Design an enzyme around this catalytic site. Structure first.
Site, PDB file in Angstrom:
ATOM      1  N   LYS B  22       7.326  -3.299 -12.090  1.00 35.31           N
ATOM      2  CA  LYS B  22       7.767  -4.468 -11.346  1.00 35.31           C
ATOM      3  C   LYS B  22       6.795  -4.764 -10.206  1.00 35.31           C
ATOM      4  CE  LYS B  22      11.824  -4.325  -9.390  1.00 35.31           C
ATOM      5  NZ  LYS B  22      13.293  -4.113  -9.289  1.00 35.31           N
ATOM      6  N   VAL B  25       5.640  -2.644  -5.681  1.00 30.60           N
ATOM      7  CA  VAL B  25       5.884  -1.208  -5.758  1.00 30.60           C
ATOM      8  C   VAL B  25       4.621  -0.372  -5.644  1.00 30.60           C
ATOM      9  CG1 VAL B  25       7.968  -1.573  -7.099  1.00 30.60           C
ATOM     10  CG2 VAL B  25       5.801  -1.253  -8.267  1.00 30.60           C
ATOM     11  N   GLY B  26       3.432  -0.931  -5.855  1.00 28.20           N
ATOM     12  CA  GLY B  26       2.204  -0.176  -5.700  1.00 28.20           C
ATOM     13  C   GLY B  26       1.414  -0.011  -6.980  1.00 28.20           C
ATOM     14  N   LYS B  27       1.497  -0.994  -7.878  1.00 26.70           N
ATOM     15  CA  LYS B  27       0.728  -0.926  -9.116  1.00 26.70           C
ATOM     16  C   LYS B  27      -0.767  -0.933  -8.826  1.00 26.70           C
ATOM     17  CE  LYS B  27       2.552  -4.628 -10.864  1.00 26.70           C
ATOM     18  NZ  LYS B  27       3.059  -5.699 -11.760  1.00 26.70           N
ATOM     19  N   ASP B  53      -3.886  -9.300 -13.463  1.00 25.32           N
ATOM     20  CA  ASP B  53      -2.852 -10.028 -12.739  1.00 25.32           C
ATOM     21  C   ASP B  53      -3.462 -11.240 -12.045  1.00 25.32           C
ATOM     22  OD1 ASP B  53      -1.042 -10.923 -10.633  1.00 25.32           O
ATOM     23  OD2 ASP B  53       0.099  -9.096 -11.038  1.00 25.32           O
ATOM     24  N   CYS B 243      17.588   9.721  13.645  1.00 24.46           N
ATOM     25  CA  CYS B 243      17.567   8.290  13.373  1.00 24.46           C
ATOM     26  C   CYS B 243      18.596   7.940  12.307  1.00 24.46           C
ATOM     27  CB  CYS B 243      16.170   7.860  12.929  1.00 24.46           C
ATOM     28  SG  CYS B 243      16.027   6.098  12.552  1.00 24.46           S
ATOM     29  N   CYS B 246      16.826   6.041   9.138  1.00 31.46           N
ATOM     30  CA  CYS B 246      16.167   6.968   8.227  1.00 31.46           C
ATOM     31  C   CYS B 246      17.175   7.840   7.493  1.00 31.46           C
ATOM     32  CB  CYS B 246      15.174   7.842   8.994  1.00 31.46           C
ATOM     33  SG  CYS B 246      13.955   6.919   9.959  1.00 31.46           S
TER      34      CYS B 246
HETATM   35  N1  LIG Z   1       2.724   4.447   0.220  1.00 34.28           N
HETATM   36  C1  LIG Z   1       2.790   3.232   0.755  1.00 34.28           C
HETATM   37  N2  LIG Z   1       3.402   3.079   1.954  1.00 34.28           N
HETATM   38  C2  LIG Z   1       3.465   1.854   2.487  1.00 34.28           C
HETATM   39  N3  LIG Z   1       3.003   0.703   2.009  1.00 34.28           N
HETATM   40  C3  LIG Z   1       2.401   0.882   0.821  1.00 34.28           C
HETATM   41  C4  LIG Z   1       2.258   2.079   0.147  1.00 34.28           C
HETATM   42  N4  LIG Z   1       1.584   1.884  -1.049  1.00 34.28           N
HETATM   43  C5  LIG Z   1       1.337   0.598  -1.076  1.00 34.28           C
HETATM   44  N5  LIG Z   1       1.807  -0.070   0.027  1.00 34.28           N
HETATM   45  C6  LIG Z   1       1.689  -1.499   0.293  1.00 34.28           C
HETATM   46  O1  LIG Z   1       2.757  -2.160  -0.348  1.00 34.28           O
HETATM   47  C7  LIG Z   1       2.321  -3.473  -0.788  1.00 34.28           C
HETATM   48  C8  LIG Z   1       2.517  -3.562  -2.282  1.00 34.28           C
HETATM   49  O2  LIG Z   1       1.689  -2.568  -2.939  1.00 34.28           O
HETATM   50  P1  LIG Z   1       0.283  -3.011  -3.571  1.00 34.28           P
HETATM   51  O3  LIG Z   1      -0.582  -1.808  -3.744  1.00 34.28           O
HETATM   52  O4  LIG Z   1      -0.256  -4.183  -2.821  1.00 34.28           O
HETATM   53  O5  LIG Z   1       0.740  -3.501  -5.029  1.00 34.28           O
HETATM   54  P2  LIG Z   1       1.656  -4.718  -5.560  1.00 34.28           P
HETATM   55  O6  LIG Z   1       1.003  -5.979  -5.053  1.00 34.28           O
HETATM   56  O7  LIG Z   1       1.645  -4.621  -7.065  1.00 34.28           O
HETATM   57  O8  LIG Z   1       3.026  -4.495  -4.973  1.00 34.28           O
HETATM   58  C9  LIG Z   1       0.876  -3.597  -0.288  1.00 34.28           C
HETATM   59  O9  LIG Z   1       0.863  -4.073   1.050  1.00 34.28           O
HETATM   60  C10 LIG Z   1       0.438  -2.132  -0.298  1.00 34.28           C
HETATM   61  O10 LIG Z   1      -0.728  -1.870   0.453  1.00 34.28           O
HETATM   62 MG   LIG Z   2      -1.006  -6.414  -7.184  1.00 37.23          MG
HETATM   63 ZN   LIG Z   3      13.667   6.340  12.245  1.00 38.39          ZN
END
Ligand SMILES: Nc1ncnc2c1ncn2[C@@H]1O[C@H](COP(=O)(O)OP(=O)(O)O)[C@@H](O)[C@H]1O
Ligand SMILES: [Mg+2]
Ligand SMILES: [Zn+2]
Ligand SMILES: Nc1ncnc2c1ncn2[C@@H]1O[C@H](COP(=O)(O)OP(=O)(O)O)[C@@H](O)[C@H]1O
Lengths: 22, 302
Positions: B22, B25-27, B53, B243, B246
């Site tokens: 999705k 998420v960090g693809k 993409d 917190c 958290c």
């Molecule tokens: N471990 C992490 N902690 C915080 N933010 C993160 C982390 N990994 C990725 N991000 C950030 O979250 C956002 C979404 O991830 P990103 O790598 O850009 O992929 P995508 O666009 O597919 O979501 C970006 O700003 C990215 O840099």
């Molecule tokens: Mg992306």
């Molecule tokens: Zn906190």
């Protein structure tokens, strides 16, 4: 949808035609 | 069993790696990092990264500019980057077949140029998926790189891209050597587990369950192996933490995390923690990759 169907046919042709590029 | 991807690097036979899931998420952040790790470990080989993409954001992660043609990274020579777009294929084609297309349309209209201007503004649905398949095939033919990494788009589209060759070979063989053999060999490699592999990304929420099950089911159909999955945006807090925020979020995550482990225990599940700042620059990448080989030490760990 009738005229749009022709547009659907127009777009459906682009898909079939673009295959020849492969 | 082991929450790491160390088993991936040892298998040098791999040729195609994928990272899907999705959005948000960090693809991209994950794929780019894993590539850097494999390069510094194998300096006597070539490697390629590629983005399918439309929301191309790799350049923002490396703090370096990239174009529609393969380039080289400044930090390391072994690695290369690239991004495919739809405004170059039409630009190069800029017709002969399009003209004949109108004649076919006009024909039916009777039995029932101006159109060229439409080609300028584009806005042709599906062009991103059509032209993208063309570019890759040109790059797939070349045999100078060793492996390839992909930063795919949402699952809604990446699947339709994988089924394309299976249908093209069908209609082609049904209506009918160098072209058919190329695609036939490609679909053969994408199906062998010793060459290809698909990895998933998600977060500890409710939508992860339904999306993950649907993804695996549609991959088993195509006979593609999914040997691991990645979780991100995790908190290292516990009830002992003062917190309240958290603490509340953690309870919400310990629930879904345990669910996924019970279902796909056979897979390599890995957990990535949350970081203070963003991930931009080679500096922050090599630190993000360490969590994928050696597991982090959480509070509840032991
Ligand atoms: N471990 C992490 N902690 C915080 N933010 C993160 C982390 N990994 C990725 N991000 C950030 O979250 C956002 C979404 O991830 P990103 O790598 O850009 O992929 P995508 O666009 O597919 O979501 C970006 O700003 C990215 O840099
Ligand atoms: Mg992306
Ligand atoms: Zn906190
Ligand atoms: N204010 C919020 N605080 C925390 N989570 C939120 C908030 N608003 C939405 N979410 C959750 O974030 C995720 C993404 O938002 P959602 O409404 O599903 O839209 P989208 O799928 O377009 O991102 C969902 O799990 C959603 O419930």
């Amino acid at each position: 949808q009738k005229y749009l169907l022709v547009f659907w046919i127009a777009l459906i042709l682009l898909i079939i035609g673009i295959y020849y590029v492969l | 069993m082991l929450p790491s991807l160390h088993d991936i690097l040892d298998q040098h036979t791999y040729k195609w790696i994928f990272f899907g899931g999705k959005g948000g998420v960090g693809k991209t952040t994950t794929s780019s990092s894993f590539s850097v790790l494999m390069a510094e470990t194998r300096p006597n080989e070539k490697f390629l990264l590629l983005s399918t993409d439309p929301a191309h954001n790799i350049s923002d992660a490396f703090d370096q500019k990239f174009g529609k043609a393969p380039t080289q990274v400044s930090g390391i020579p072994n690695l290369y980057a690239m991004e495919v777009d739809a405004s170059n294929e039409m630009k190069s084609a800029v017709x002969x077949x399009x003209x004949x297309x109108x004649x076919x349309x006009x024909x039916x209209x009777x039995x029932x140029t101006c159109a060229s201007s439409f080609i300028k503004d584009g806005t042709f649905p599906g062009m991103d998926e059509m032209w993208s398949f063309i570019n890759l095939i040109k790059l797939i033919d070349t045999n100078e790189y060793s492996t390839v990494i992909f930063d795919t788009a949402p699952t809604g589209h990446t699947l339709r891209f994988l089924e394309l060759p299976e249908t093209v070979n069908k209609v082609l063989e049904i209506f009918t050597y160098p072209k058919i053999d190329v695609v036939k060999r490609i679909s053969a490699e994408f199906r062998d587990p010793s060459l290809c592999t698909f990895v998933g990304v998600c977060i500890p929420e409710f939508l992860s369950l339904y999306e993950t099950e649907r993804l695996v089911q549609r991959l088993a159909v195509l006979d593609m192996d999914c040997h691991a999955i990645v979780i991100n945006f995790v908190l290292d807090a516990n009830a002992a933490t003062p917190c309240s925020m958290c603490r509340s979020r953690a309870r919400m995550q310990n629930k879904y995390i345990d669910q996924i482990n019970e279902l796909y225990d056979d897979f390599n599940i890995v957990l990535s923690p949350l970081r203070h700042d963003e991930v931009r620059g080679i500096a922050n990448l090599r630190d993000y990759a360490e969590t994928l080989i050696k597991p982090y030490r959480f509070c509840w760990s032991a």
